[PDB]
Design a protein around this ligand. Structure first.
Ligand SMILES: [C]=C1O[C](O[C]2[C]([C][O])O[C](O[C]3[C]([C][O])O[C]([O])[C]([O])[C]3[O])[C]([O])[C]2[O])[C]([O])[C]([O])[C]1[N][C]1[C]=C([C]=O)/C(=O/[C]2O[C]([C][O])[C](O[C]3O[C]([C][O])[C](O[C]4O[C]([C][O])[C](O[C]5OC(=[C])[C]([N][C]6[C]=C([C]=O)C(=O)[C]([O])[C]6[O])[C]([O])[C]5[O])[C]([O])[C]4[O])[C]([O])[C]3[O])[C]([O])[C]2[O])[C]([O])[C]1[O]
Ligand SMILES: OC[C@H]1O[C@H](O[C@H]2[C@H](O)[C@@H](O)[C@@H](O)O[C@@H]2CO)[C@H](O)[C@@H](O)[C@@H]1O
Ligand SMILES: OC[C@H]1O[C@H](O)[C@H](O)[C@@H](O)[C@@H]1O
Ligand SMILES: OC[C@H]1O[C@H](O)[C@H](O)[C@@H](O)[C@@H]1O
Ligand SMILES: [Ca+2]
Ligand SMILES: [Ca+2]
Ligand SMILES: [Ca+2]
Ligand code: NA
Length: 481
């Protein structure tokens, strides 16, 4: 049976503490639609209640302690969370937790730290003398105390910050001085060294820190009974740390712990290097495909549809790609805003959901909408495609990426899924038809478009071929009627 994950959040969900409850209540519907894993937002305390979670204040406060002005996180309390996970797991849906280990924000107090400024465009170039800054690096977790963990964070657990509370300059990155203090390596080499992203950057060279994060990772998996992770900001975290943290957590828990890293670069070579340095022990989001889809959707029909998978992880390394159309960073108004145009979204979902390559992810924003921007729910258009994935997308695949507008693939179906088999055909331009082979054994069958976009039927010829059709700027997915 086909695996499908859903990112069950968007950036602009309301701060009403009701999200875990909504997820609990949707667990049954999600399973019905063929969702098999749910990626949940950061469950811990961020820098305030309305923090999406990536502010990472206290990884041991899952909406449990009164900290940063709130007991609950944005999404709800710890018990509402456990009860969502229970409901998901009772519906046979796995839960992947987001993991933010790059930095900590929202420190309880500042420390006077000797530091040097480096060039934000080349973090290896020091551009000041050493001097003392006031850095937000002291974490004492007053509201939690030592419950679950007595680890306290101090300046020497971090490599730098971008904010001197005493001087308050923007566009500064401060590297901490101290014995053995250096930006972590290997990380992405954009800006010379991209270890520093925001807030207080965690020093992955620090043995106390490595041990703490490993232990936290076990605690988090154990406390929530997680099935895997989405690892945030991996281009900024020492690659060997991530590789080994994941191996540690899997070994400690005896669980598979499927993991997908967000390595946000539109560059297969960088992704492949990350995969090499992490020994292929986890998957990456297919950021290149995302940009291919985004660009195609903006190309008014003129994208060469035959090249849609070019340069992508899913083309090259299908077993290590999590494919996605959009996410909470690419949604409108966000940091990596590159939102696939609505008309193209169904074609994009069909590409990720009906092909045998990649582990596809459905975005909450797409499925349910983003009311704050004017993004309607596309559930009605995604549902037929999820249905295709769940019941029909099985067996040998034949691709037809051979025209600049109309492309397609078929799936021969297989014995373990009765009536499985499909032919997906799409056009970013005028409609048209394509002959495609669905399997000799399907000769004589009458197929219909499960999306309903093309009325009518197609009968498979004696040889297992048919002339499948699609409307302009549309996808049709033909399956045995
Ligand atoms: C998103 C992303 O990012 C990145 O990426 C990148 C990009 C963008 O940039 O770019 C590029 O890419 C490219 C593209 C684009 O254009 O294109 C293409 O084509 C290409 O190819 C590509 O490549 C690059 O490359 C890249 O890389 C990264 O990488 C990624 O990964 C990402 N994503 C992810 C991640 C993350 C993490 O985080 C996330 O994110 C998000 O979220 C965040 C967080 O939230 C955000 O952030 C923002 O915001 C923030 C907040 O604000 C910031 O921070 C800052 O600020 C602050 C302040 O405000 C600070 O802090 C400090 O200080 C303070 C003051 C303190 N506090 C205190 C005080 C008080 C009063 O008095 C109290 O209340 C308290 O308590 C105390 O404590 C603190 O503590 C301190 O610490 C800091 O420092 C700073 O930093 C930041 O910065 C910003 O940024 C963002 O935006 C978002 O998006 C995400 O989601 C994920 O998924
Ligand atoms: O809907 C039929 C129509 O769909 C596609 O057109 C897109 C256009 O390419 C985009 O630029 C967008 O702005 O809107 C249209 C969909 O509303 C096909 O590209 C076009 O050939 C086809 O006739
Ligand atoms: O085929 C790619 C992916 O599909 C799904 C599987 O659960 C996942 O582990 C695999 O990596
Ligand atoms: O007649 C059109 C189609 O029918 C079948 C043929 O074997 C295939 O090669 C052809 O494209
Ligand atoms: Ca370091
Ligand atoms: Ca870092
Ligand atoms: Ca085209
Ligand atoms: Na670091």
């Amino acid at each position: 049976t086909n695996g499908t994950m859903m990112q069950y959040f968007e950036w602009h969900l309301p701060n009403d503490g009701q999200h875990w409850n909504r997820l609990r209540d949707d667990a049954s519907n999600l399973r019905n639609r063929g969702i098999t894993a749910i990626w949940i937002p950061p469950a811990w305390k961020g820098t305030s209640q309305n923090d999406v979670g990536y502010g990472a204040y206290d990884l041991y406060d899952l909406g449990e302690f009164n900290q940063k002005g709130t007991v609950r996180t944005k999404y709800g309390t710890r018990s509402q969370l456990e009860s969502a996970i229970h409901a998901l797991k009772n519906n046979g849906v796995q839960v992947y937790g987001d993991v933010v280990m790059n930095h900590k924000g929202g420190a309880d107090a500042t420390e006077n730290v000797l530091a040097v400024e480096v060039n934000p465009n080349n973090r290896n170039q020091e551009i000041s003398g050493d001097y003392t800054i006031e850095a937000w690096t002291k974490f004492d977790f007053p509201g939690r105390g030592n419950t679950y963990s007595d680890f306290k964070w101090r300046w020497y657990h971090f490599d730098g910050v971008d904010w001197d509370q005493s001087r308050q300059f923007q566009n500064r990155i401060y590297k901490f001085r101290g014995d053995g203090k250096a930006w972590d390596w290997e990380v992405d080499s954009e800006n010379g060294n991209y270890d520093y992203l925001m807030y207080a950057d965690v020093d992955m060279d620090h043995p106390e820190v490595v041990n703490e994060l490993r232990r936290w990772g076990e605690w988090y998996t154990n406390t929530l009974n997680l099935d895997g992770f989405r690892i945030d900001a991996v281009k900024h975290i020492k690659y060997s740390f991530t590789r080994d943290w994941l191996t540690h957590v899997r070994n400690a828990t005896g669980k598979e712990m499927f993991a997908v890293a967000e390595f946000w670069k539109n560059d297969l070579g960088a992704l492949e290097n990350y995969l090499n340095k992490t020994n292929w022990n986890h998957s990456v989001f297919d950021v290149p495909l995302h940009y291919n889809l985004y660009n195609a959707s903006n190309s008014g029909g003129n994208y060469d549809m035959a090249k849609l998978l070019n340069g992508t992880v899913v083309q090259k390394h299908p077993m290590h790609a999590v494919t996605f159309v959009d996410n909470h960073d690419s949604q409108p108004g966000e940091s990596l805003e590159s939102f696939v145009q609505e008309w193209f979204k169904p074609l994009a979902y069909a590409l990720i959901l009906t092909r045998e390559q990649g582990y596809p992810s459905v975005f909450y924003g797409d499925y349910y909408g983003i009311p704050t921007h004017s993004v309607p729910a596309m559930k009605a258009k995604i549902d037929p495609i999820l249905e295709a994935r769940q019941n029909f997308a099985y067996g040998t695949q034949h691709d037809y990426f051979d025209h600049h507008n109309i492309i397609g693939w078929t799936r021969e179906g297989n014995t373990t899924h009765p009536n499985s088999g499909l032919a997906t055909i799409m056009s970013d331009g005028p409609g048209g038809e394509k002959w495609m082979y669905v399997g000799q054994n399907k000769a004589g069958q009458v197929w219909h478009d499960i999306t309903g976009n093309k009325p009518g039927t197609v009968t498979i010829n004696a040889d297992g071929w048919a002339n499948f059709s699609v409307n302009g700027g549309s996808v049709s997915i033909w399956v045995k009627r």
